[PDB]
Amino acid sequence: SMEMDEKDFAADSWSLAVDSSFLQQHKKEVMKQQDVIYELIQTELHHVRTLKIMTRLFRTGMLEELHLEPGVVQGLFPCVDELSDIHTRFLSQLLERRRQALCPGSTRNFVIHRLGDLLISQFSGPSAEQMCKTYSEFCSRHSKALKLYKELYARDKRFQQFIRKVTRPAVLKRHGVQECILLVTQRITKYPLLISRILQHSHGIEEERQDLTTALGLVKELLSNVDEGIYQLEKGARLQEIYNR
Amino acid sequence: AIRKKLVIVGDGACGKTCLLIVFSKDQFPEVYVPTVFENYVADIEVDGKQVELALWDTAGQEDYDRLRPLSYPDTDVILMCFSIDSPDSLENIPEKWTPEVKHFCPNVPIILVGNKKDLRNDEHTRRELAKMKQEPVKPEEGRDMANRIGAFGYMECSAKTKDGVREVFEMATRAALQ
Numbered sequence: 040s041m042e043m044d045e046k047d048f049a050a051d052s053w054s055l056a057v058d059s060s061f062l063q064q065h066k067k068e069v070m071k072q073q074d075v076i077y078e079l080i081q082t083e084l085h086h087v088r089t090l091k092i093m094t095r096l097f098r099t100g101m102l103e104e105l106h107l108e109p110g111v112v113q114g115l116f117p118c119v120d121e122l123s124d125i126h127t128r129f130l131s132q133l134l135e136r137r138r139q140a141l142c143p144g145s146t147r148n149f150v151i152h153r154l155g156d157l158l159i160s161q162f163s164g165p166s167a168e169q170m171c172k173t174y175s176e177f178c179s180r181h182s183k184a185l186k187l188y189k190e191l192y193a194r195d196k197r198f199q200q201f202i203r204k205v206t207r208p209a210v211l212k213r214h215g216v217q218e219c220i221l222l223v224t225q226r227i228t229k230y231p232l233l234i235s236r237i238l239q240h241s242h243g244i245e246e247e248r249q250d251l252t253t254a255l256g257l258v259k260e261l262l263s264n265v266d267e268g269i270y271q272l273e274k275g276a277r278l279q280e281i282y283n284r
Numbered sequence: 285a286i287r288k289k290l291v292i293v294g295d296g297a298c299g300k301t302c303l304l305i306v307f308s309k310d311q312f313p314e315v316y317v318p319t320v321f322e323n324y325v326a327d328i329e330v331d332g333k334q335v336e337l338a339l340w341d342t343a344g345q346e347d348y349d350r351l352r353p354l355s356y357p358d359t360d361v362i363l364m365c366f367s368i369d370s371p372d373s374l375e376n377i378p379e380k381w382t383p384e385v386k387h388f389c390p391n392v393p394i395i396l397v398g399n400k401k402d403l404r405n406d407e408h409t410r411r412e413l414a415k416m417k418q419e420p421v422k423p424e425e426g427r428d429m430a431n432r433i434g435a436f437g438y439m440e441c442s443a444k445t446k447d448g449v450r451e452v453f454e455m456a457t458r459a460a461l462q
């Protein structure tokens with residue numbers, strides 16, 4: 040992540056991020072709504088960061104330092120460039136919505152009143168089809184990636200030294216290769232939990248309540264489609280085991 | 285330090301997310317209680333042994349039968365949660381959660397955990413349950429369920445007061461080491 044965004048999302052909540060003299064001007068219901076919107080953006084910033092660790096630290100580091108057999112790095116990090124494109128674009132829209140909402144003279148005081156429309160756009164049309172196709176492919180390749188990782192770590196000395204080297208810093212404690220893969224798979228199922236809680240505190244404007252209700256339905260439809268499109272790939276699986284599913 | 289992996293399972297209203305948050309921060313958040321939990325790697329020392337215990341939540345995965353099992357590979361200990369203010373959450377343990385965990389995590393110890401133990405003597409809770417001919421889960425009901433499902437053990441805690449929380453994760457670490 041970049042320092043500007045890290046600092047904007049360093050606090051544990053929106054109520055601790057804004058100036059207290061700004062917080063004091065708002066009703067409790069607005070503060071409860073803003074705290075959950077802040078959590079959605081903060082966790083999206085962290086999810087994009089997980090994808091940058093996978094693409095820049097692990098994937099590129101393996102291509103530039105190790106002599107792995109072709110098709111091995113793609114097997115460890117399936118769809119990571121596509122996932123990075125989807126989420127970096129989504130994160131850009133969320134951060135621009137916050138930026139436009141800042142008070143003049145402030146880099147931290149804002150209220151986001153219109154999130155629903157952004158969520159409907161993300162979870163409908165071509166961007167939703169791209170999310171569905173990419174997660175169906177990623178989640179079907181999840182178990183294969185973990186097994187490929189475990190095999191390389193146990194048998195390749197240079198691979199083991201590379202992993203131990205790049206994951207030694209304390210900031211990588213929660214972000215080893217297998218941890219990144221599960222963090223990405225679990226990201227999509229966090230969205231209904233966050234959206235439902237934002238909706239709970241967005242009844243003040245009927246258009247916003249309706250938009251968040253539509254967004255929640257779209258996210259659930261996307262998840263149902265992804266869940267129905269998953270069949271775990273297994274290295275060396277025989278056709279007979281596949282057609283006898 | 286050896287690395288172990290813990291996964292918590294249970295119904296949506298069982299309090300699993302709150303339990304992971306309170307343990308990982310060592311406090312019940314006073315300003316904002318997070319909606320979700322990403323992951324955490326706890327440094328735990330139990331009975332003289334140092335372990336890095338990776339913590340994972342299955343919240344949000346309850347309705348997705350093909351995404352949810354992706355949380356299980358290489359799990360060392362399962363916390364199977366129910367809420368003491370919800371006898372319905374205890375009923376789903378033996379024939380929904382238990383056969384799933386035994387299938388994807390064979391031979392992995394399961395600790396049955398009764399969450400929200402502070403609500404057992406809460407007047408509002410007792411009034412609300414008595415309208416559906418119910419009462420908070422009794423300690424013997426939790427123990428008998430844990431015994432029935434082949435659990436490694438039975439424990440109770442309250443994420444709200446923190447009581448029992450440290451003990452659950454220290455025991456989970458010992459189970460993961462066996």
Ligand SMILES: COCc1cc(C(N)=O)no1
Pocket residue numbers: 051055313314315316317
């Ligand atoms: C009042 O700032 C300290 C603080 C933050 C929190 C929280 N994370 O909810 N509890 O206490």
Ligand SMILES: COCc1cc(C(N)=O)no1
Pocket residue numbers: 306307308309310327328329330450454
């Ligand atoms: C909040 O957790 C309490 C706790 C205990 C320990 C330990 N026993 O090392 N580590 O954390």
Ligand SMILES: COCc1cc(C(N)=O)no1
Pocket residue numbers: 182271353354355356357358359388389
């Ligand atoms: C590698 O541990 C066993 C395993 C496999 C799976 C799975 N999801 O196929 N879950 O746990």
